[PDB]
């Protein structure tokens, strides 16, 4: 039979319809008065969180992060530039808002490591994402056969190096064949052409 | 070219800033809950460096010593009242609803409880005209009919220090001293006396503007100089 | 000028560094103070 989780999933397929439409209209009023990074005891989307790797265990932290909507907040050139490089308005950043949210969360929690993240909506001027972070030093996580991989030294600052899920997708590593000639194994090895 | 003087202003550097550390008080109306039972005695009459007009030191019933925007005629010993049931005497502050029509008023609020925005300079006054349950029409010193909320507070009388504009500065030094107390860069060099690099009107073998002086509203900072969006120019016609 | 305790220790060291290479080092090495600093001709730190 269907899990209770499947109903949280089905509700979030259309966040502008049903009971969720009313819920988000209410919640966002409280969220807009909240900070940049807010630690929350329980995830707003349980199904998505558990699907991404969350466990109701010690050393597993969740945090909601708000990042602004739109393109790059770029300064106009202060010296000689050819027409192609004279733009300000139409320039967008190469990292998506989700990735920015994950980094801001990881900074607030210097000891923890980013496991994953998901969208929890947006209004007219900002986007909210909930980031699942893990304590690599807590023995509750060091003994977990499903999460102890994140404890390894090479997993230190994994978000800042693009090793996160949203990182790998934004780096164009999804496809294993056609189109990923300049993305795999890294953007930098391929001369930054990805 | 180089950024014009008006662009250097916005950066808010020392030269363009007001000597705030030398200013006395931010003359706002007192905060009452209701009941009106707030009155005070005028202790001293001081000079206000910010507006070149006098200001009155008042000591209230609840032990609060605050400087108030002095209307004409207010002296030491006089009792001023602030509130709804306040007496309709010069120097008292009450909402526009309680003040009778045809009475000269000053230090008028824009939104109720803001402390006063309009009619504050030397010798000016706002004129309360029409009453309603929704709107209080006040005629501001510029001649504009401002429709306001009757709950907006105001002080009865004209502002003190009237006729300041009547006497000439005579010499540059007198202007210098006044300007040192304000947030303004002085003296003023004409754009027409500058180089092309420094101003839109700069350059040339003789002094004259390079294009017409009437600039569009849509003009960007660096170009918006001369006669800003003028509906007309000149005296005649 | 007014010197601090640390500045005084540093000036003290610079004065000590200004002493000559002892007579015996010449005999031991069988035959030059490259850090000779004058108060007027040279300049110290700070």
């Amino acid at each position: 039979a269907r899990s209770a989780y499947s109903y949280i999933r089905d509700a979030w397929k259309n966040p502008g319809d049903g009971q969720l439409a009313e819920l988000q209209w209410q919640r966002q009023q409280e969220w807009r008065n909240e900070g940049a990074v807010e630690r929350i005891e329980r995830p707003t989307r349980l199904d998505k969180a558990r699907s991404q790797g969350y466990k109701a265990k010690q050393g597993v932290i969740v945090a909601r992060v708000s990042v602004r909507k739109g393109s790059a907040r770029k300064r106009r050139h202060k010296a000689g530039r050819r027409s192609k490089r004279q733009g300000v308005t139409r320039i967008t950043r190469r990292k998506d808002i989700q990735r920015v949210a994950e980094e801001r969360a990881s900074r607030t929690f210097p000891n923890l490591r980013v496991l994953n993240s998901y969208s929890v909506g947006q209004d007219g001027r900002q986007k909210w994402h909930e980031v699942i972070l893990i304590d690599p030093n807590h023995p509750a996580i060091q003994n977990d056969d499903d999460l102890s991989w994140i404890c390894a030294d090479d997993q230190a600052d994994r978000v800042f190096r693009g090793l996160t899920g949203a990182g790998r997708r934004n780096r164009g590593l999804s496809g294993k064949g056609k189109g990923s000639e300049k993305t795999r194994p890294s953007l930098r090895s391929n001369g930054g052409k990805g | 070219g180089r950024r014009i003087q008006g662009q250097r202003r916005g950066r808010g550097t020392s030269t363009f800033r007001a000597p705030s550390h030398r200013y006395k008080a931010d003359l706002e109306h007192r905060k009452v809950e209701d009941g009106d039972v707030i009155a005070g005695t005028v202790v001293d009459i001081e000079h206000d460096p910010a507006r070149s007009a006098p200001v009155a030191a008042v000591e209230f019933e609840d032990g609060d010593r605050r400087l108030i925007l002095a209307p004409e005629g207010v002296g030491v010993g006089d009792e001023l009242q602030v509130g709804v049931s306040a007496e309709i005497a010069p120097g008292n502050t009450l909402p526009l609803a309680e003040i009778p029509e045809g009475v000269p008023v000053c230090n008028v609020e824009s939104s109720p409880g803001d402390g006063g925005k309009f009619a504050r300079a030397s010798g000016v006054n706002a004129q309360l005209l029409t009453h309603d349950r929704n709107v209080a029409v006040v005629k501001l010193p510029s001649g504009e009919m401002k429709r306001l909320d009757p709950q907006c507070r105001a002080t009865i009388g004209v502002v003190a220090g009237g006729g300041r504009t009547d006497k000439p500065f005579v010499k540059a030094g007198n202007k210098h001293h006044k300007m040192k107390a304000r947030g303004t860069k002085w003296p003023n060099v004409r754009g027409v006396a500058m180089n092309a690099v420094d101003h839109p009107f700069g350059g040339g073998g003789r002094q004259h503007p390079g294009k017409p002086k009437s600039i569009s509203r849509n003009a960007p900072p660096g170009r918006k100089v001369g006669d800003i969006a003028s509906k007309r120019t000149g005296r005649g016609g | 000028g007014k010197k601090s305790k640390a500045t005084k220790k540093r000036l003290a060291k610079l004065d000590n560094q200004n002493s000559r290479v002892p007579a015996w080092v010449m005999l031991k090495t069988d035959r030059r103070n490259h850090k000779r600093r004058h108060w007027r001709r040279n300049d110290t730190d700070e």
């Binding site: 509700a11 819920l23 209410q26 | - | -």
Partner: protein, 119 residues
């Protein structure tokens, strides 16, 4: 709050939790939202309980509309920890289900009838 369409009186809630306490010691109960949902879907649920202080509301949001199309009666409890203590847990419970009562079958039937009268 968004899933709550009726207020349950303090006295009715007392009756409901007392009935749940004797349902674990005699009959059978399901503890936790996932187990409550499968109880409604399989049809084995006699009476389902739902907490009102669930944050996020998503976890429990579906119980009212689901129980309506499966004919399963539901009642709201104000607190999460009270429902968990009643089910016999040290922790709280967002939802509980009485899968076939026991020596409370008469009381549960009255609670189901008292709720329908309260819309």
């Amino acid at each position: 709050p968004v899933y709550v369409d009726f207020d349950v009186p303090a006295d009715l809630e007392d009756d409901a939790l007392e009935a749940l306490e004797v349902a674990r010691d005699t009959g059978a109960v399901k503890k936790g939202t996932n187990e409550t949902t499968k109880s409604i879907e399989r049809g084995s649920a006699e009476l389902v309980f739902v907490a009102e202080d669930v944050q996020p509301e998503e976890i429990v949001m579906h119980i009212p509309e689901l129980a309506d199309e499966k004919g399963v009666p539901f009642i709201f409890v104000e607190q999460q920890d009270d429902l968990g203590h009643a089910a016999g847990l040290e922790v709280g419970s967002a939802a509980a289900a009485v899968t076939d009562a026991g020596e409370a079958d008469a009381d549960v039937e009255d609670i189901a009838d008292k709720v329908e009268e309260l819309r």
